[PDB]
Amino acid sequence: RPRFSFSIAAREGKARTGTIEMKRGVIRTPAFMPVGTAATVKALKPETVRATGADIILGNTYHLMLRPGAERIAKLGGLHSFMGWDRPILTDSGGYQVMSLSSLTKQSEEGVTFKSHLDGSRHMLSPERSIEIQHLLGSDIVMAFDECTPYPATPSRAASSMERSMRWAKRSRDAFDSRKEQAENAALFGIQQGSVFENLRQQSADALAEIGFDGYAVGGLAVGEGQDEMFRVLDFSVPMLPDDKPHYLMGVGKPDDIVGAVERGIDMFDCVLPTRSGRNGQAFTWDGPINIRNARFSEDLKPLDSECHCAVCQKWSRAYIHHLIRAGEILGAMLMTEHNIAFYQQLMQKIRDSISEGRFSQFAQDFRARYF
Ligand SMILES: [Zn+2]
């Protein structure tokens, strides 16, 4: 019922479990958000995504602003009605994908100019245009527009990028607030930057806290630094953010990354891996990933995972999925993606339960032992 309310139900070390209540639904944390790139979670109907246990999905603003266009989606009734997902949706700012998939990017204090990677170039993206687009889509959780720092980054480089991001954070907050309908029904998350330098991370955290956000994302990670570095940065960075607000780690999704991140105080995750790997033939299991294409699964009657309770593993065998994937059949992608998303959701549930029972430490230890 409320616009945004985060409650921590239980804690264990830095890990915590709770719920985020929003107008469109409740989100159980730690949460994993499946990625909906072009207004669709790859090969899955919304009902199937919900069936796996997902409380919220992420919408890629970059893709949507190009096709079919934020203005058109708004005219059509908003992203929710368009794609058939009635629960909360978090949309990114679009900046990350602009710097990664756009042609001839142009950085400036006002924003970034670019060429669409498919057909001419729907072209200007600033803090306020980003917020406007997210409003047009009608997302529930809006991300502030920032400048991600590449890895590696020199201190001065990371500093200047972080400083710009904080100026943009303020501009994102102001833009969000001017739009009453948006400020009253949506939530705004700020993004901490600063690369791997704790002094920069600290400055970022403070600036962010001074502005004030509904949630805080730890940006600049999973960009080539490796798990060890990521974890080291999380160790000192997360404690810098407000404890009573959700902590969101953007673009982090390997099962072990998630477990280690939750141990360090992260509440939300998102990543394309489950859907992506599904199409590639990689299935996640409690005993590690397996590539279903390999010949040893040709006559394996066991389900993808014998402890998974998803619909796929309750009805089909590895042999069948192996056949579908090697035949390049669409159902192969459908089945693999459903199981993968379900596996992630089950992992999150086990994490939430273990924290609530004060045995998350043992769970993480046992998980790693079996998974590897
Ligand atoms: Zn399954």
CATH number reported for the structural domain that contains residue 100 in this entry:
3.20.20.105
Q: Which two tokens stand for residue 364?
A: 């993480």
CA distance 113 to 149: 17
Q: Which two tokens stand for residue 7?
A: 């409650």
Residue 96 assigned as binding residue: yes
Residue 313 assigned as binding residue: yes
Phi, psi of 146 (to 5 degrees): -135, -175
CA distance 122 to 119: 9
Q: Which two tokens stand for residue 256?
A: 């072990």
How many domains, the chain? Answer: 1
Q: What is the DSSP string of 193-220?
A: --TT-HHHHHHHHHHHHHH--SEEEE-S
Which method resolved this structure?
X-ray
CA distance 78 to 269: 24
Residue 281 assigned as binding residue: no
Provide the 3-class DSSP secondary structure of residue 95.
helix
Q: Which of 211, 142, 160 is nearest to 3 (CA)?
A: 142
How many angstroms is it from 339 CA to the middle of ligand 1? 4
CA distance 172 to 217: 14
Does the N-terminal peptide bond of residue 152 adopt cis geometry, omega within 30 degrees of 0? yes
- The answer to whether the beta carbons of residues 156 and 40 sit under 8 Å apart is no
Residue 220 assigned as binding residue: yes
CA distance 35 to 139: 14
How many angstroms is it from 140 CA to the middle of ligand 1? 29
Strands (E), 221-270: 247-249, 268-270
Domain span at residue 137 reads 1-372
Burial of 164 (0-12, 13-18, 19+ CB in 10 A): middle
Residue 253 assigned as binding residue: no
Beta-ladder partners of 21: 5, 26
CA distance 184 to 80: 17
Q: Which of 53, 59, 52 is nearest to 79 (CA)?
A: 59
How many angstroms is it from 15 CA to the middle of ligand 1? 26
How many angstroms is it from 42 CA to the middle of ligand 1? 17
Residues with catalytic roles: 92, 270
How many angstroms is it from 142 CA to the middle of ligand 1? 31
Helix (H) or strand (E) holding 92, with range, is none
Which pairs from 17-26 meet CB under 8 Å and 24+ separation?
17/351, 17/352, 17/355, 17/356, 18/267, 20/215, 20/246, 22/88, 22/140, 22/141, 22/187, 23/140, 23/185, 24/80, 24/86, 24/87, 24/88, 24/140, 25/55, 25/56, 25/87, 25/88, 26/55
Burial of 337 (0-12, 13-18, 19+ CB in 10 A): buried
Q: How many CB atoms are located within 10 Å of the residue 257 CB?
A: 21
